[PDB]
Coordinates of C-alpha atoms and ligand atoms in Angstrom, one line a residue:
Chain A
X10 CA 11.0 47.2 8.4
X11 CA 13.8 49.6 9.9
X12 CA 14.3 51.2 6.2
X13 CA 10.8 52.4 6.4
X14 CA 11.6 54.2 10.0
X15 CA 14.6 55.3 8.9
X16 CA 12.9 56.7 5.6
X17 CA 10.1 58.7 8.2
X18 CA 12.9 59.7 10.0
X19 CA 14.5 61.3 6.7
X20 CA 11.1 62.4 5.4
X21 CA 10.7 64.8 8.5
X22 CA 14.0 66.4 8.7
X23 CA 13.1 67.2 5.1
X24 CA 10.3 69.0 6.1
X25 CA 12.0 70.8 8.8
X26 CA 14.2 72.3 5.8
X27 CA 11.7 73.8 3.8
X28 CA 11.1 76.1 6.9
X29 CA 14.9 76.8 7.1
X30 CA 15.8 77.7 3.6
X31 CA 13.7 81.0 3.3
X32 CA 15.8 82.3 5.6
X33 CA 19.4 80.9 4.7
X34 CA 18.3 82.2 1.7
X35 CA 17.1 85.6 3.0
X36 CA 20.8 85.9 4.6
X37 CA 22.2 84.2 1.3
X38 CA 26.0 84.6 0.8
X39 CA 28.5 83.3 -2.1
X40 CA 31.6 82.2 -2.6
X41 CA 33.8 81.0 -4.9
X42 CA 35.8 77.4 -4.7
X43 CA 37.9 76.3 -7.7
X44 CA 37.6 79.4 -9.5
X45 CA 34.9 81.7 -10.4
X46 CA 32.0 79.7 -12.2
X47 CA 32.6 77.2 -9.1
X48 CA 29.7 78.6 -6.1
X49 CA 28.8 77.8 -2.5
X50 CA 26.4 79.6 -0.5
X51 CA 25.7 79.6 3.1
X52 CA 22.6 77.3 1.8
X53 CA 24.8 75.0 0.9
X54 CA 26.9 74.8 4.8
X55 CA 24.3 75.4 6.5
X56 CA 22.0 72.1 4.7
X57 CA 25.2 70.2 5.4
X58 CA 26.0 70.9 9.3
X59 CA 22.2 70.5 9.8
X60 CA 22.3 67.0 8.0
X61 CA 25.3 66.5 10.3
X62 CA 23.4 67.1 13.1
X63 CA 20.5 65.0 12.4
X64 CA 23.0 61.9 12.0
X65 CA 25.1 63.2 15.3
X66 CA 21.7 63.1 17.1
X67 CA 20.1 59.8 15.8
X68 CA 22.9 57.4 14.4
X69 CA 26.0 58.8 15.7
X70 CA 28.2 55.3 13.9
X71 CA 26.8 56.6 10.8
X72 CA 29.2 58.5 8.7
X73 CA 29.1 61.3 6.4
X74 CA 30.8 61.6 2.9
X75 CA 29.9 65.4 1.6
X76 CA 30.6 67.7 -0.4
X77 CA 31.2 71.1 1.7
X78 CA 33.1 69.3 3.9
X79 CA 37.0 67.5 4.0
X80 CA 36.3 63.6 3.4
X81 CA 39.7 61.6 4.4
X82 CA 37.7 57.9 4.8
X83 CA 37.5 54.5 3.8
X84 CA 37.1 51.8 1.2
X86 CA 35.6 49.6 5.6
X87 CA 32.2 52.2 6.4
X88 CA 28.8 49.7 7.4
X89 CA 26.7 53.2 7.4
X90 CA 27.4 55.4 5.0
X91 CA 25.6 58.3 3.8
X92 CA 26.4 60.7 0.7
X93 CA 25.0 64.3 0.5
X94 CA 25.0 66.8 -1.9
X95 CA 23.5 69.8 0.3
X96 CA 22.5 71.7 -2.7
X97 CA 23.2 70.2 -6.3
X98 CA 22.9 73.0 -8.8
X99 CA 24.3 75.9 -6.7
X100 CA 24.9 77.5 -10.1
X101 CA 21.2 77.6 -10.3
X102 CA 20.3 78.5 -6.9
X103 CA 22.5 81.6 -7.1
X104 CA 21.7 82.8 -10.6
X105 CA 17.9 81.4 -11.0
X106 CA 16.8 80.4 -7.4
X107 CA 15.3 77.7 -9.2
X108 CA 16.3 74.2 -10.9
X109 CA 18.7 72.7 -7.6
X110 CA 18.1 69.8 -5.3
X111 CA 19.3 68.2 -2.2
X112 CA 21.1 64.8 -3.3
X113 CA 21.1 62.2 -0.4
X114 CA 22.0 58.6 -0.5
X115 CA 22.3 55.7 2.3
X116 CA 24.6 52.7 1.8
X117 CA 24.9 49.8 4.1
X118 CA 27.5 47.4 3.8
X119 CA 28.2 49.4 0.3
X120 CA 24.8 48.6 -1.1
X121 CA 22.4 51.4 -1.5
X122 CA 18.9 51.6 0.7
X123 CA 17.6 54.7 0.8
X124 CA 17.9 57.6 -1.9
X125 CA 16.5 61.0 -1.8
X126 CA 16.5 63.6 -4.5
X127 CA 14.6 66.9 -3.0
X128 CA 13.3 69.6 -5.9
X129 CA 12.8 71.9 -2.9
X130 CA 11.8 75.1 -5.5
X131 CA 9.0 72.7 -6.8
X132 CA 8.2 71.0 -3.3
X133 CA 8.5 67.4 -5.1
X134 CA 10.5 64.7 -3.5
X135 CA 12.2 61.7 -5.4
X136 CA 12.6 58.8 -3.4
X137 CA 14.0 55.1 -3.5
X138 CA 13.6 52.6 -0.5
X139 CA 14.6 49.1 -1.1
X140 CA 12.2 46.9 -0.4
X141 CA 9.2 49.2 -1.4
X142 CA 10.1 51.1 -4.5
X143 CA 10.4 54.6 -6.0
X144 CA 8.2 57.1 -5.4
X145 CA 7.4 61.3 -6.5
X146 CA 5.7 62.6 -3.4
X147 CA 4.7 59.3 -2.4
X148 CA 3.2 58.1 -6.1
X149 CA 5.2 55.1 -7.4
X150 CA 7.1 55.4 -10.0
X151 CA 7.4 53.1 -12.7
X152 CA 10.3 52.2 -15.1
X153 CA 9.6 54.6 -17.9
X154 CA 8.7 53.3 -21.4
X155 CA 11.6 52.5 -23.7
X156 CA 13.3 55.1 -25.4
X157 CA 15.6 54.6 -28.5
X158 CA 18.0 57.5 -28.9
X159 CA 16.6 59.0 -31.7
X160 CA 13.8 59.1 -29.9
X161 CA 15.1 60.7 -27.1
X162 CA 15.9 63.9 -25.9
X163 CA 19.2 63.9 -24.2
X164 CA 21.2 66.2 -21.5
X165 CA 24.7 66.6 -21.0
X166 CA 27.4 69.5 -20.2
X167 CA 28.5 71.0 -23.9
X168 CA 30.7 72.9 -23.0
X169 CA 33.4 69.7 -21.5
X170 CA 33.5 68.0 -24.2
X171 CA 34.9 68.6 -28.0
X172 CA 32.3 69.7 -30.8
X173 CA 32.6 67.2 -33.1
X174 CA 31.1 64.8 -30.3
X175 CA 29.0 67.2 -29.3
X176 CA 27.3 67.3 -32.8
X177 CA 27.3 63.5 -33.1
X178 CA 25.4 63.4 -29.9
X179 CA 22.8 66.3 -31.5
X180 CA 22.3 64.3 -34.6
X181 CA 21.6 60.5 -32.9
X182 CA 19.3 62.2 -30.3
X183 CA 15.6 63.5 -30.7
X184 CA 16.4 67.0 -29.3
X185 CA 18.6 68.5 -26.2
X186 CA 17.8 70.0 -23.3
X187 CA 19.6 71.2 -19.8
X188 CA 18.4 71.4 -16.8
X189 CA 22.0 72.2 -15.0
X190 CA 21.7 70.4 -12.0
X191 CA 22.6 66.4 -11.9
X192 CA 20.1 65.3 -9.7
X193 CA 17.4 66.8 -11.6
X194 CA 18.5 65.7 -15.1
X195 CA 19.1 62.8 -14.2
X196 CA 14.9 62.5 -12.3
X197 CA 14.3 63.5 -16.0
X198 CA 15.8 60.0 -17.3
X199 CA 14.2 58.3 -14.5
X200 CA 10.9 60.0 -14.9
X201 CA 11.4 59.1 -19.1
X202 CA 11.1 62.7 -19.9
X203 CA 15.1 62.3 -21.2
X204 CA 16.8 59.3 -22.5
X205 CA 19.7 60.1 -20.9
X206 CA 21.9 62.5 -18.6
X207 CA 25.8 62.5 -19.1
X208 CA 28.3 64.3 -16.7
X209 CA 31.9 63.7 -17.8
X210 CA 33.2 64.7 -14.1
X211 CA 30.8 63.7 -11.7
X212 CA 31.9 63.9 -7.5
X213 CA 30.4 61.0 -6.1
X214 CA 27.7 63.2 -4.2
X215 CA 27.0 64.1 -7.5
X216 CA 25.3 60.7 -8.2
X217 CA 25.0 59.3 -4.7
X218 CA 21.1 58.9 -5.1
X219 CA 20.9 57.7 -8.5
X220 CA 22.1 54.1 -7.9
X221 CA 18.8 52.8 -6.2
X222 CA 16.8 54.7 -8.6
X223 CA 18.2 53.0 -11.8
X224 CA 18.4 49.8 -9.9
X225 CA 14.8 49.9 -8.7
X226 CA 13.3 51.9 -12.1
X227 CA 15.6 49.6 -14.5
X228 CA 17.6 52.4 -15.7
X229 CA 21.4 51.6 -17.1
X230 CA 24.3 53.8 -15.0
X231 CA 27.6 53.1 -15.5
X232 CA 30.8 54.6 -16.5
X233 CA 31.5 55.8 -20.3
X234 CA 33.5 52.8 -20.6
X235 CA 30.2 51.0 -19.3
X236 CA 31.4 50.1 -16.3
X237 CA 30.2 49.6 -12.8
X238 CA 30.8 53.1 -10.8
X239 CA 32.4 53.2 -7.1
X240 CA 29.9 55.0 -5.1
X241 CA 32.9 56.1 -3.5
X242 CA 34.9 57.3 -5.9
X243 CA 33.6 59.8 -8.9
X244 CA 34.0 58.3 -12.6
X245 CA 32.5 60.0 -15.8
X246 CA 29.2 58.5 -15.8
X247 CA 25.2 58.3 -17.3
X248 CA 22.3 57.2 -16.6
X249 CA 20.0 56.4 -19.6
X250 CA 17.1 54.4 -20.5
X251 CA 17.7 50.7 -21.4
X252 CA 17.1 51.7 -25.1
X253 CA 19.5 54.4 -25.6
X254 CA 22.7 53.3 -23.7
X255 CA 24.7 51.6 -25.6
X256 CA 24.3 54.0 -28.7
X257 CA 25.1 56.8 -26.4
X258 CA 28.5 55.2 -25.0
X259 CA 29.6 54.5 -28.5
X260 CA 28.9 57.8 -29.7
X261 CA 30.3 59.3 -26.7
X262 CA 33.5 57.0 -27.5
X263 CA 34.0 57.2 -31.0
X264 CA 36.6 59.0 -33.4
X265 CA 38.7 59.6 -30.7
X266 CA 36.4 60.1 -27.8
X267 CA 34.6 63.2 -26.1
X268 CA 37.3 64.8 -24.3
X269 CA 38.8 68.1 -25.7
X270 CA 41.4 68.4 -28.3
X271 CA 41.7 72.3 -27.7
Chain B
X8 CA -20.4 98.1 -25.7
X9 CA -16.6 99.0 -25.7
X10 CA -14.6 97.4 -22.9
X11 CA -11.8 98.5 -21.1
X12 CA -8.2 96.6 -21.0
X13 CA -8.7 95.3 -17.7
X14 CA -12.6 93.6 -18.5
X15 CA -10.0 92.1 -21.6
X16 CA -7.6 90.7 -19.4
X17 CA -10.3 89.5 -17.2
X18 CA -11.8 87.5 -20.0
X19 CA -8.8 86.3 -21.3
X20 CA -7.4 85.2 -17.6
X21 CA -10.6 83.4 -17.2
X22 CA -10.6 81.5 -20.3
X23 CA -7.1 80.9 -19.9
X24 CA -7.7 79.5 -16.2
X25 CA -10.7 77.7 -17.6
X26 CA -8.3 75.9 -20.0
X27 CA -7.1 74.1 -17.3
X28 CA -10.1 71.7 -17.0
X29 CA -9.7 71.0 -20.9
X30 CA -5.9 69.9 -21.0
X31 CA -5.8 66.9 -18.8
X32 CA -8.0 65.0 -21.2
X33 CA -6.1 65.8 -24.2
X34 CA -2.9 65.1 -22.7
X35 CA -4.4 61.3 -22.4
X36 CA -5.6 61.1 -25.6
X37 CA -3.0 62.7 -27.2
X38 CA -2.3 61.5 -30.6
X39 CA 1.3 63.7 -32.7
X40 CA 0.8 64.8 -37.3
X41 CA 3.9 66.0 -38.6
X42 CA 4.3 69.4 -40.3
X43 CA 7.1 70.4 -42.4
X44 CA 9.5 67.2 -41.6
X45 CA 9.3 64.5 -39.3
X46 CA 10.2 66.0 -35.9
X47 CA 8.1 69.4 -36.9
X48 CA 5.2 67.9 -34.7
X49 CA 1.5 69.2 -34.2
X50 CA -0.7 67.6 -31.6
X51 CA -4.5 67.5 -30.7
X52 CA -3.5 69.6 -27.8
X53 CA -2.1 72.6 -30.0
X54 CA -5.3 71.9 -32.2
X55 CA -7.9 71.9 -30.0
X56 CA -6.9 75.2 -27.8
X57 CA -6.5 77.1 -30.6
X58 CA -10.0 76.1 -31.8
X59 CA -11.2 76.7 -28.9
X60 CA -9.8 80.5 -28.9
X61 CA -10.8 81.0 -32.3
X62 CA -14.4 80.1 -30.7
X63 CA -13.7 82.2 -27.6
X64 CA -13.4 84.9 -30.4
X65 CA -15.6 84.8 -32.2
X66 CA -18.1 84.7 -29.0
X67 CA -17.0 87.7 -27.5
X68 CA -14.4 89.9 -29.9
X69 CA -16.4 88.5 -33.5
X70 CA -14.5 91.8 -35.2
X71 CA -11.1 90.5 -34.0
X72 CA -9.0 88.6 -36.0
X73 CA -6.3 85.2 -35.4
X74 CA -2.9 85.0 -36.4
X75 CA -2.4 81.1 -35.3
X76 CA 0.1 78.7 -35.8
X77 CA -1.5 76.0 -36.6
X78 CA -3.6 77.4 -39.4
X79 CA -3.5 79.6 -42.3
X80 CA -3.2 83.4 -42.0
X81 CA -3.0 84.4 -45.8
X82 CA -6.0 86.5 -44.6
X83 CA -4.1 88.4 -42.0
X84 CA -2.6 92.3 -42.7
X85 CA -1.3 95.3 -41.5
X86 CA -4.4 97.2 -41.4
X87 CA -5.5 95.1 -39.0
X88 CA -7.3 97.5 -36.1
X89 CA -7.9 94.4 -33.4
X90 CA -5.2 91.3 -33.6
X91 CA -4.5 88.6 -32.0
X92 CA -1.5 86.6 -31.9
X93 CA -1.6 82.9 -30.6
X94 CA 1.1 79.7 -30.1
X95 CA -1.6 77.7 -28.8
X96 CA 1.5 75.3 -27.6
X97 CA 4.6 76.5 -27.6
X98 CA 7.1 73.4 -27.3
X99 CA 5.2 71.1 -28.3
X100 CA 8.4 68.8 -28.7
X101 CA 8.1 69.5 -24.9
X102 CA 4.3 68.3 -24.5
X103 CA 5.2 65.2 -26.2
X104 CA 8.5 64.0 -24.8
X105 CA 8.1 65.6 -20.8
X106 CA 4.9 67.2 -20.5
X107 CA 6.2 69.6 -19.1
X108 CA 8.2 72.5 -20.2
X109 CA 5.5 74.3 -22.5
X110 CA 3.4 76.9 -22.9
X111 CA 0.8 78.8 -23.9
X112 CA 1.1 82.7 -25.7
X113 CA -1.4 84.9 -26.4
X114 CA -0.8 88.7 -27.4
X115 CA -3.2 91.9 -28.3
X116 CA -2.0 94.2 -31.1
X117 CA -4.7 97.6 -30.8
X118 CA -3.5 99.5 -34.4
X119 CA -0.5 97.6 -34.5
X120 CA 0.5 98.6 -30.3
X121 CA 1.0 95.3 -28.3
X122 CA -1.8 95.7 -25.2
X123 CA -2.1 92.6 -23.7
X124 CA 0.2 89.7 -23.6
X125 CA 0.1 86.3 -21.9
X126 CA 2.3 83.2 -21.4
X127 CA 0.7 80.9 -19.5
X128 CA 3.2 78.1 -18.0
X129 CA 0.2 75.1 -17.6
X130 CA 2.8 72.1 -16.3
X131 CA 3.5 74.9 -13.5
X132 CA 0.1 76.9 -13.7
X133 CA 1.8 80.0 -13.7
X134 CA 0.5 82.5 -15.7
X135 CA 2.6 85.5 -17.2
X136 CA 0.6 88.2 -18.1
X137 CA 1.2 91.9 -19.1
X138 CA -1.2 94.3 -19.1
X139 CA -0.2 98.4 -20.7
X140 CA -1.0 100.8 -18.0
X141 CA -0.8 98.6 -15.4
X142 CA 2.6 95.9 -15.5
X143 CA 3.6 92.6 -15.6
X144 CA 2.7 89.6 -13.3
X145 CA 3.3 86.2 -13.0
X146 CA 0.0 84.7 -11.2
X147 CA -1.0 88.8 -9.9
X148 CA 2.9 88.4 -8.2
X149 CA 4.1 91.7 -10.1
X150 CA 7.4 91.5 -12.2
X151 CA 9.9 94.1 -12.3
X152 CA 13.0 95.3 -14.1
X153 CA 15.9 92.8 -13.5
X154 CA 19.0 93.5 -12.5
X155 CA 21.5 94.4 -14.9
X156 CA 23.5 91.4 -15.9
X157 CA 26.5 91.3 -17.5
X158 CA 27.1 88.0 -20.1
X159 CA 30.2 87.1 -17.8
X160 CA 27.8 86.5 -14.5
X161 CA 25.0 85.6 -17.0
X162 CA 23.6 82.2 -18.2
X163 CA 22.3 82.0 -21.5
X164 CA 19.7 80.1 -23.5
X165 CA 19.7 79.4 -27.0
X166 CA 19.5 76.3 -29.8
X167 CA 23.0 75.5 -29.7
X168 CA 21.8 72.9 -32.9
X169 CA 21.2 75.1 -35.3
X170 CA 24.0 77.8 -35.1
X171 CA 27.5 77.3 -36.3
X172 CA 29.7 75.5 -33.9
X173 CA 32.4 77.9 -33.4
X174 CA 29.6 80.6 -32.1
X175 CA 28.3 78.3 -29.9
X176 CA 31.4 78.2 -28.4
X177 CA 32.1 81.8 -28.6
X178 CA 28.7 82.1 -26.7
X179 CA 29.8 79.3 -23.9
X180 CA 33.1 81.2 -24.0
X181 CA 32.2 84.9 -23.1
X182 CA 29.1 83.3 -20.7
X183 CA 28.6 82.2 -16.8
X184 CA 26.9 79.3 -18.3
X185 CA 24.1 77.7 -20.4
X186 CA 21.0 76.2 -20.3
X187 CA 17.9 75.3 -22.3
X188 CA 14.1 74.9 -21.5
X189 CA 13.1 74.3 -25.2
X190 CA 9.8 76.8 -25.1
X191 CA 10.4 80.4 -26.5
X192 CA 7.8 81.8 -24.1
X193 CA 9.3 79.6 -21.4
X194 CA 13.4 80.7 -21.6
X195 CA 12.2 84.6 -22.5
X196 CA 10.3 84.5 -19.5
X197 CA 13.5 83.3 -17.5
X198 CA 15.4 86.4 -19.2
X199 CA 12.1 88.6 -18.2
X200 CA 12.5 87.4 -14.4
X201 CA 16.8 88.0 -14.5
X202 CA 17.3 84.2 -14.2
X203 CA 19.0 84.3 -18.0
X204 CA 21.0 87.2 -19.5
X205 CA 19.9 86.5 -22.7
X206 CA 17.2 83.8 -25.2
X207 CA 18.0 83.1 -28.7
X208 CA 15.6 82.3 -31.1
X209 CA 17.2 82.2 -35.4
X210 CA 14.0 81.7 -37.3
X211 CA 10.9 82.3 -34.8
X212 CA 7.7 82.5 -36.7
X213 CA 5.4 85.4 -35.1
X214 CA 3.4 83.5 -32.6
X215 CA 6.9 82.6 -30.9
X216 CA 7.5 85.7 -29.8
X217 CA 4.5 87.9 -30.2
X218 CA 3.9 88.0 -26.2
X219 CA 7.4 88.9 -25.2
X220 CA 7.3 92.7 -27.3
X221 CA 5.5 94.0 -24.1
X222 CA 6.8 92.2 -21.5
X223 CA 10.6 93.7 -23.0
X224 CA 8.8 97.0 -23.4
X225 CA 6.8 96.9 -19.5
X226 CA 10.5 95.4 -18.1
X227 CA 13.4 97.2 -19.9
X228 CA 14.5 94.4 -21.8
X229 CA 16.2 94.3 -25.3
X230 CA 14.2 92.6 -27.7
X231 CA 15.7 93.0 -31.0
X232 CA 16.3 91.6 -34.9
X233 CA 19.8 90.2 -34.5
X234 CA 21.0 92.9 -36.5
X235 CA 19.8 95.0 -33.7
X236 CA 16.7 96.3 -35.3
X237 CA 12.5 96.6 -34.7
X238 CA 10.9 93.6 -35.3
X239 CA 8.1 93.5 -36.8
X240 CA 5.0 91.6 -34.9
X241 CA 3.0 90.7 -38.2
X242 CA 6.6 88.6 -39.9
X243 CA 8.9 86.2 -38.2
X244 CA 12.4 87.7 -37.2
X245 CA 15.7 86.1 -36.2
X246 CA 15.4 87.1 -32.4
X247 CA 17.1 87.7 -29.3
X248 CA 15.5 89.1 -25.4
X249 CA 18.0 90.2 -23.5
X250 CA 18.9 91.7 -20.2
X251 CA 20.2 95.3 -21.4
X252 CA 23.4 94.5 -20.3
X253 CA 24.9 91.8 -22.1
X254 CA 22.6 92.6 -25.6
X255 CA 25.6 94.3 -26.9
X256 CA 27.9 91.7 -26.5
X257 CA 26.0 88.9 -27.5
X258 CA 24.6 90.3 -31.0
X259 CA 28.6 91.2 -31.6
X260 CA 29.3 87.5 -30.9
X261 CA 26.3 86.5 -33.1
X262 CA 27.7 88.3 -36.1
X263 CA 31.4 87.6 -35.3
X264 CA 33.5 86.4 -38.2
X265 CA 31.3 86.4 -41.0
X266 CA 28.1 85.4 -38.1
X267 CA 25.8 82.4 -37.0
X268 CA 24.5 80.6 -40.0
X269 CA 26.4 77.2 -40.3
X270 CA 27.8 78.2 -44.2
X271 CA 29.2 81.8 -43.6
Ligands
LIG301 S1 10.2 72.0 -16.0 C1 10.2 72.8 -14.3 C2 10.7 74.2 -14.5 O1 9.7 75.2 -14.2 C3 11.9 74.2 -13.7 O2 12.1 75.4 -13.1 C4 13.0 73.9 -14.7 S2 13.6 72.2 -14.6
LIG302 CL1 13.6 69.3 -13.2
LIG303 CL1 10.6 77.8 -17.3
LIG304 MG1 29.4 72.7 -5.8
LIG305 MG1 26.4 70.8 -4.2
LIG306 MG1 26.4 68.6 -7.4
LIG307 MG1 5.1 73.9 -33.8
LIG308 MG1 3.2 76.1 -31.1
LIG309 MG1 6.4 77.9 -30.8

């Protein structure tokens, strides 16, 4: 009852933002964080303080864990919400295509609401416990299964050692990146991939994808198939129900995925 | 008669756009053949377009002849004075697995001189066309020469299955980053708009890259042999489009250390 207000709520400050970015991006400025290949833009702030607003101005108890921002807090919060202001800011910079907005709302630690915003394509993933998961308000459904071989699968190459990389080419039907983890991860929900690894996730990262593969019977867990602490990044997938447990062993065996060199 | 280019590209747009109507009703009844191995997959969405572009053809161009994928071209030359050149889908691993992500190319050889090229992005309904004498568009938006792009700030598309393992990692070494769309048409486009420095392709057959030839030519891109050479329109070539700036570097990791192949 109060997840669907809630939900409107969201839905309109999400439509507010398609008015905003043209010009953030108009006035578009980069960084660098970590080092050079890591980006933020004043897209990315600016997204963020806005969200920061909304929740300042309509649930000021609520709290925010994100990413362009300092996040010394607790594991504890009743209303929690995750952003990722813009996943794929390596795309946004060098494409201005293929990123998202990642938002997620936990109460009590259990997911509610989950948003995953393709802005450049105007189509919005949502999950609302209670109701379901929808594409611009169609429902999706949980996608047909998919054995690996069947499947094409996504993952970083380039953080993991080759040997893996070639058992994962040769179990899988083909492989494909998209480059942002929100959106590869739509693909696995959507059954268009089997299967989206990220060996280094922050938990904004994969802050939406909980009620998704909870509601769409998806598998999302650790590499060592664990549950994952929304608080708390671990290596992680998401996968169809027919390819995850021949991914994780792959993506364990002879030694593991992690580089040797 | 004897038409102009444009009245061409107003035909083709409109069959193109007309193509539209089609495709939603052989998506739902699609049913996959196999080709040369298992995963080398045909549909009765590749079969039917091109059938129906043959027919197009043979309506209003009956002297022009088809180079097609999926069909037999034994019949095809290089005397040819009117030629087209058509992927009818291009990633069709795409169409079958996403539905999205694929394409359709179409090029015009006059005398062996690309004229009229086309890749129409149906999931998106974008349509790439480029027309000699007057540019290239994407849905009448006009494209222009992208920046120049260095392979450092650049990301780069290619089949990282296919190539030996330590270029691939020469590639994700000297890079920004990678990515992959899995359509020819699709990823050269993305180096044709500055979005990628630089698409791959080791064993394209014509149809996978006969579009792109004018859109490098109308946009100052490199589109070479990867040897650096001509390639020629009428027989496949290994392939690479490229920003101009980072060609250079990426053909000299290509044939690094003896080059790509897997044995070398
Ligand atoms: S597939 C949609 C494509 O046009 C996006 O830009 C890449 S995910
Ligand atoms: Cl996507
Ligand atoms: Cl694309
Ligand atoms: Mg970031
Ligand atoms: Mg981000
Ligand atoms: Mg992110
Ligand atoms: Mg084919
Ligand atoms: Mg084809
Ligand atoms: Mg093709």
């Amino acid at each position: 009852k109060t997840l669907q207000q809630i939900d409107k709520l969201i839905c309109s400050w999400l439509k507010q933002i398609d008015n905003v970015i043209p010009q953030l991006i108009m006035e578009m400025t980069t960084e660098t964080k970590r080092h050079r290949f890591d980006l933020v833009t004043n897209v990315d702030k600016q997204i963020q303080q806005q969200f920061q607003q909304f929740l300042a101005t309509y649930f000021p108890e609520h709290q925010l864990l994100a990413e362009e921002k300092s996040n010394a807090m607790i594991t504890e919060i009743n209303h929690l919400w995750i952003m990722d202001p813009i996943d794929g800011t390596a795309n946004l910079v060098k494409q201005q295509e293929d990123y998202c907005i990642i938002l997620a709302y936990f109460y009590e630690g259990k997911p509610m609401l989950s948003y995953v915003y393709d802005y450049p394509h105007k189509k919005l993933y949502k999950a609302i416990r209670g109701e379901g998961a929808f594409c611009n308000g169609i429902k999706m459904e949980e996608p047909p299964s998919l054995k690996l071989e069947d499947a094409i699968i996504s993952f970083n190459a380039q953080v993991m050692n080759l040997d893996t990389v070639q058992d994962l080419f040769d179990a899988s039907f083909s492989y494909r990146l998209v480059g942002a983890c929100g959106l590869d991860s739509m693909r696995v929900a959507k059954g268009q991939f089997g299967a989206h690894i990220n060996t280094n996730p922050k938990p904004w990262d994969i802050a939406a994808q909980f009620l998704f593969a909870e509601l769409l019977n998806l598998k999302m867990t650790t590499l060592d198939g664990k549950a994952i602490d929304h608080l708390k990044g671990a290596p992680f997938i998401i996968s169809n129900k027919a390819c995850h447990e021949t991914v994780l062993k792959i993506l364990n065996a002879n030694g593991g995925y992690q580089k040797y060199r």
